[PDB]
Design an enzyme around this catalytic site. Structure first.
Site, PDB file in Angstrom:
ATOM      1  N   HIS A  88      -6.315   9.862   8.688  1.00 32.43           N
ATOM      2  CA  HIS A  88      -5.736   8.612   9.210  1.00 32.43           C
ATOM      3  C   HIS A  88      -5.816   8.540  10.709  1.00 32.43           C
ATOM      4  O   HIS A  88      -5.500   9.502  11.417  1.00 32.43           O
ATOM      5  CB  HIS A  88      -4.260   8.502   8.814  1.00 32.43           C
ATOM      6  CG  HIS A  88      -3.955   9.193   7.527  1.00 32.43           C
ATOM      7  ND1 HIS A  88      -4.556   8.844   6.334  1.00 32.43           N
ATOM      8  CD2 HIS A  88      -3.126  10.222   7.243  1.00 32.43           C
ATOM      9  CE1 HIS A  88      -4.105   9.627   5.370  1.00 32.43           C
ATOM     10  NE2 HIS A  88      -3.229  10.466   5.892  1.00 32.43           N
TER      11      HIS A  88
ATOM     12  N   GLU B 270      -3.049  -0.823   6.502  1.00 33.61           N
ATOM     13  CA  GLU B 270      -3.367  -2.194   6.093  1.00 33.61           C
ATOM     14  C   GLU B 270      -2.087  -3.041   5.951  1.00 33.61           C
ATOM     15  O   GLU B 270      -0.971  -2.507   5.979  1.00 33.61           O
ATOM     16  CB  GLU B 270      -4.185  -2.207   4.788  1.00 33.61           C
ATOM     17  CG  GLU B 270      -3.402  -1.954   3.484  1.00 33.61           C
ATOM     18  CD  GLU B 270      -2.947  -0.510   3.270  1.00 33.61           C
ATOM     19  OE1 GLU B 270      -3.363   0.407   4.021  1.00 33.61           O
ATOM     20  OE2 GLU B 270      -2.170  -0.294   2.311  1.00 33.61           O
TER      21      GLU B 270
END
Length: 311
Positions: free
Chosen positions: A61, A186
């Site tokens: 990430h 997201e």
């Protein structure tokens, strides 16, 4: 070489990972067979393998915890709201930045509404020339590395990203088509639906010392004991076959590892570099652990046994 220093120090709060994505892209473009940004902002790099009948997905990430400018006060100070998990109690006196402009959090002349960032302005009009409602605020931190330990911010998960970049820089010959994915927050069913991997390896950073008053210094994931191999994650289906392949790969390659101790829809494994908090935002990683994590990921990729065990 390694870009942990730049990765760590760079701003990339959740929802605002563009600079981090651009940086990673500049480092891996000539190392991969294909590279693109999907519709949500994930950076997807492909390293084709000897066998394209199956696909391995390896991910990290890009995002970090931060804030967002919610209001510009008439005195030039700005109000902000958290982006991720942040304890407002430890924020007074912390240095932050908004579009390369440094500021310091302080009280207004245990809530976010009571905190203000001071960048040095006297009026709302002055502040607006540099700042705007909706801008992302990140912590400011240096990166220091000595005697095998490194201190800086966002090691969760900028160390994981760095590991992937280093595996690629070291020249990797994958057994199966391997996608290196650098994810964003997201507004994953998408990444898996688009790539349809046989299985995945998630590269994370696991941080100990969250609570100093009740911290566990003996029964925890430790700096120096190697990458941690997760047995149960609740977020990922980690079948015994995968867990054991990772462990055996480690043992047969003389790579130190430890069990994960904490106080997608496809078979996955999770591997973590240990970190320990020092003075949040900062944490510490052991460079030998980092190297062993990179070694382990490279062997899992080149051998493909992790793909073969679930197909």
């Amino acid at each position: 070489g390694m870009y942990l220093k730049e990765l760590s120090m760079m701003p990339g709060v959740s929802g605002d990972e563009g600079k981090v994505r651009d940086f990673i892209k500049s480092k891996i473009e000539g190392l991969v067979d294909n590279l693109y940004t999907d519709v949500l902002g994930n950076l997807i790099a492909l390293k084709r393998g000897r066998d394209s009948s199956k696909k391995l997905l390896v991910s990290a990430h890009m995002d970090e915890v931060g804030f967002v400018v919610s209001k510009i006060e008439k005195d030039g100070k700005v109000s902000f709201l958290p982006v991720g998990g942040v304890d407002p109690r430890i924020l007074p006196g912390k240095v932050v930045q908004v579009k390369n402009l440094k500021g310091v959090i302080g009280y207004r002349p245990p809530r976010f509404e009571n905190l203000r960032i001071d960048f040095g302005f006297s009026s709302a009009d002055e502040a607006k020339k540099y700042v705007s409602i909706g801008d992302y605020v990140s912590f400011v931190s240096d990166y220091i590395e000595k005697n095998g330990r490194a201190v800086g911010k966002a090691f969760d998960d900028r160390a994981g990203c760095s590991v992937l970049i280093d595996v690629l820089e070291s020249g990797v010959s994958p057994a199966y088509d391997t996608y290196f994915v650098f994810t964003v927050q997201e507004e994953s069913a998408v990444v898996v639906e688009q790539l349809k991997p046989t299985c995945a390896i998630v590269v994370e950073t696991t941080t100990a010392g969250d609570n100093p008053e009740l911290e566990e210094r003996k029964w925890a994931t430790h700096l120096g004991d190697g990458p941690a191999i997760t047995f149960y994650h609740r977020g990922y289906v980690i079948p015994k076959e995968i867990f054991q392949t990772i462990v055996d790969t480690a043992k047969n390659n003389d790579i130190p590892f430890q069990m994960k101790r904490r106080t997608y829809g496809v078979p996955a494994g999770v591997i973590s570099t240990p970190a320990r908090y020092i003075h949040s935002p900062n944490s510490i990683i052991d460079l030998n652990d980092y190297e062993n994590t990179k070694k382990l990921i490279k062997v899992l990729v080149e051998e493909g046994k992790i793909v073969e065990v679930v197909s």
